[PDB]
Each structure stands twice: as C-alpha cells, then as structure tokens.
C-alpha cells in the first residue's frame, strides 16, 4: 500500500505548493501596483512576506521531490504509471514557475531600488518556454490518463480528476505570472 499512500500524499504536497505559489503571486502583483503608483506621483513588511513564502515553497518542493523519488522507486499497470508521471510533470511545472516567480521578484527589487536586464530577459524567456512545454506535456499526459480509465475503484479516477484541477490551477497561475512579466517590462521601459 506504500505506492497508493505515497501517490495520495503527493497530491496534497502539490496542492500545498500551488496554494503557496498563489500567495506569492499576489505579493508580486501588490509590489508592481505600488511601484506604478510611485511613478504616477510597507516595503519592509513585503520583504518579510516574500521571504516567508519563498522559504515555505522551498520546503514544500523539497518534500514533494522526496516523495516523488519514493513513488517512482515503489512503482518499479499503465494507469498507476501515468498517475506517477503526471505528478512528476506537475512538480516540474511548479519548480519552473517558482524560478520564474523569483526572477519577477528580482525585477521588482531592482525597479524598487531606483524608485527609492538583458540577462534577466534571457532567463525569463528560457523559463517561460520551458513552462509552456511542461504545461503541454501535462495536458498530453492528462488525456492519456483519462483514456486509460476507460480501458482501483473510484480512487484512481478521483486522483485523475484532481490532477486535471491541479493542472488547471498551474495554467491560471501561468496566465497571471505572464501578466506580471508584462507589467515589469512596462515599468523597465519607463525608467530606461
């Protein structure tokens, strides 16, 4: 039962990571709004919240990596294998998105110092590209998994359904992440 128990736990690890990511995205959105209001014309607390959620997500990603390793090892039919791979896919998307979020945080902080880049751009582009491919690969795995269900009870179908909601939440998070990159690029243009 160690695989099935690990797969269930890994679903909760991923949800918790995505939740923590969501709070972090809201903080970067606040930061950008505040910056725009000053060029139109609390930061110590903002730093602390950024540092707290950054630490939290780091520890949640570490737990999810360690659980992934355990499940992949216990795995060694196609359904379970698909479910484990889809956990890996989602995890990779979260790791990638977190790095993009940390690049946006860096941008905010630079802009902030001047209201108190070529390499940045290149890294944003590289990770954005990566994330698009990981989302595409998760969508493909999700179709596959849904097809395997047609050909363990309601437990496995339930997990497949929740993985669809986790991917949906990653996609929504990417939509808003990409919006913060556009906002930081608009602010960058204005100071240059």
């Amino acid at each position: 039962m160690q695989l099935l128990s690990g797969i269930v736990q890994q679903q909760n690890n991923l949800l918790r990571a995505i939740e923590a990511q969501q709070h972090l995205l809201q903080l970067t959105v606040w930061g950008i709004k505040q910056l725009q209001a000053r060029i139109l014309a609390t930061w110590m607390e903002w730093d602390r919240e950024i540092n707290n959620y950054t630490s939290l997500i780091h520890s949640l990603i570490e737990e999810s990596q360690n659980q992934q390793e355990k499940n992949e090892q216990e795995l060694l039919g196609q359904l379970l294998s698909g479910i484990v791979q889809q956990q890996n896919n989602l995890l990779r998307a979260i790791e990638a998105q977190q790095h993009l979020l940390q690049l946006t945080v860096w941008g905010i902080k630079q802009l902030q110092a001047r209201i108190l880049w070529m390499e940045w751009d290149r890294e944003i582009n590289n990770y954005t590209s990566l994330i698009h491919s990981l989302i595409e690969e998760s969508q493909n795995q999700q179709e596959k998994n849904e097809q395997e269900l047609l050909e363990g009870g309601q437990l496995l179908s339930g997990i497949v359904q929740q993985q669809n909601n986790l991917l949906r939440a990653i996609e929504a998070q990417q939509h808003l992440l990409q919006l913060t990159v556009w906002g930081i690029k608009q602010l960058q243009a204005r100071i240059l």
């Epitope: 959105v29 751009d121 590209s129 939509h175 808003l176 990409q178 919006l179 608009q186 602010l187």
Partner: antibody, heavy 117, light 108 residues
C-alpha cells in the same frame, strides 16, 4: 465583450478621448491594447495598459501625445490623443491582450475619429 | 523598437492553391509571434499565437512556423473565406509592433 464609444469629429489641434468598456474578468487578468487603422492602411499599435497594475506603454510615434488610462471601478479603459492632425483620421480599436495566448483574442468594433475643419 | 517586415505585400492565388507568407523581425522574438486575419469592414481576428498554435475557431488548413527572426504562415488549400489581409504582431517586447500586412487576392 469590448464596447467602444461612438464616432467623433474633431478639428486639428484638438484632442479626443475614446473609451472601451469591458467585464470584471477582463480587467482583473488581461491587458488592453489600442490599435488604429487609417483608411486603406495597416494596423498600428498605439499603446496598452494592464488595469490591475495601472502600467502602460506607448509606441514611439505617439510618445508625448497619447495617454491610456483604465479605471477598475467601472472596468473602462480610455485612449486620449492630443494635437490631432489630419493623418490621425482612422478607426481606433481596443483589443484584449491575453497572456495565455500572447495575442489579442477579443476586439471592439472600432471608433471612427475624423480630424478636419 | 522591433520592426516587422511582411513579404510579399500582395499575392494572387486560385481558390484551392496553397500559399505561404512570411514575417521577419529586426531582432530575435523567440516564438512570440501572432498572425491575424482581417476582412474589409471588420476588426482583426487572431488565427495563430506563439508562432505555431491554432487559435480557437481557426481551421486546420492554417499552420504557422518559425523561430527567432523568421516566421511563416501557410494555408494548404485556399477557400474563399481565406482571402483577406494578414498581419503579424510580435509580443516579445514593448512597444508591440505589427507587420505591414499581406493582402491575398483571388486569381481567375
């Protein structure tokens, strides 16, 4: 989904402010672009705003003369073009820039602005 | 700013023919390139986003290709509704910029 204000006539040197009304959803997760097209000519990007931040960017040609604002309380975006000359006569479109697509998925119907005496 | 150049400016082809049009950026824009279709009297319509993805409501006879600085839109077999002006637009960096357009005309 994007409702624009009615056609306008202005004299040279005057200004015009055109509006684009969207939903709640648009203003909380999308960007708004303004794009114009003189009769028989091509599309020209004027600028854009991201309402949740208030950030904006303008094309080089209109720096100095264009202002884009958006007030979240009415989900309305506006484009104000100053020092109007006759070559500004065009259809002015608002467009919703979708960050999942990196493209414009919805357009308003366009607003005729005619600049003449 | 980033300059977009479309080629050719105009093109004639029979209904049923294949065509390719091209868009070139003055600097690398990765895959951040969209194509739009416009009929006279109408707003533009997104057909392709991120260089090669079909937008909702765009038929499979359309495809896009390319990366960096050189991009292409291909229609494998033209139907009456495809004769229109096509614009590219880069979404790599602000300010955003359109190509000059390619008008497609029916040959008879």
């Amino acid at each position: 989904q994007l409702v624009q204000s009615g056609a306008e006539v202005r004299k040279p040197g005057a200004s015009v402010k055109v509006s684009c009304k969207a939903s709640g959803d648009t203003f909380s997760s999308y960007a708004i672009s303004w794009v114009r097209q003189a009769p028989g000519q091509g599309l020209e990007w004027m600028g854009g705003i991201i309402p949740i931040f208030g950030t904006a960017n303008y094309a080089q040609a209109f720096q100095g003369r264009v202002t884009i604002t958006a007030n979240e309380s009415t989900s309305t975006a506006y484009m104000e073009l100053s020092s109007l000359r006759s070559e500004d006569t065009a259809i002015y479109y608002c467009a919703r820039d979708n960050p999942t697509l990196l493209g414009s998925d919805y357009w308003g119907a366009g607003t005729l602005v005619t600049v003449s005496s | 700013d980033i300059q977009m150049t479309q080629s050719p400016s105009t093109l004639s082809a029979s209904i049923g023919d294949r065509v390719t049009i091209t868009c070139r950026a003055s600097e690398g824009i990765y895959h951040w390139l969209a194509w739009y279709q416009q009929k006279p009297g109408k707003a533009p319509k997104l057909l392709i986003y991120k260089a090669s993805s079909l937008a909702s409501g765009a038929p499979s006879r359309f495809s896009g290709s390319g990366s960096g600085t050189d991009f292409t839109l291909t229609i494998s077999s033209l139907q009456p509704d495809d004769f229109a002006t096509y614009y590219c637009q880069q979404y790599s960096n602000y300010p955003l910029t359109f190509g000059g357009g390619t008008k497609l005309e029916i040959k008879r």
